[PDB]
Amino acid sequence: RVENMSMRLEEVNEREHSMKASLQTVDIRL
Amino acid sequence: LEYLRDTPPVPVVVCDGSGRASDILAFGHKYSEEGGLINESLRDQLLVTIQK
């Protein structure tokens, strides 16, 4: 289950990268 | 740029995750396509990270 932790929190990390780009662009859009 | 436009051309390496200008080479690293072909959303996010 530590193997499963590593891959799933990897998915969370890259997804949050997409969210950071989106929210910074939205802050620029307001 | 003085290292690159030089005889002989000096190889150079950039480290990531630290901060400031090195990271705006990192964004000029993974999203670059064919060399210097950089789009508009990425240049503008780059401009606001220089402005921040």
Q: Does A21 touch chain B (CB under 8 A)?
A: yes
Do A24 and B48 lie within an 8 Å CB cutoff? yes
Owner of token pair 């240049």: B43
Residues 6+ apart with CB under 8 A from B6: none
Measured CA to CA, the distance from residue B23 to residue B50 in angstroms comes to 10
**Which CA distances in Å does A11 have to A1, A22, B39?**
15, 17, 26
Angle B26-A9-A7 from CA coordinates, rounded to 5°? 95
Distance from CA of A16 to the nearest CA of B (A): 16
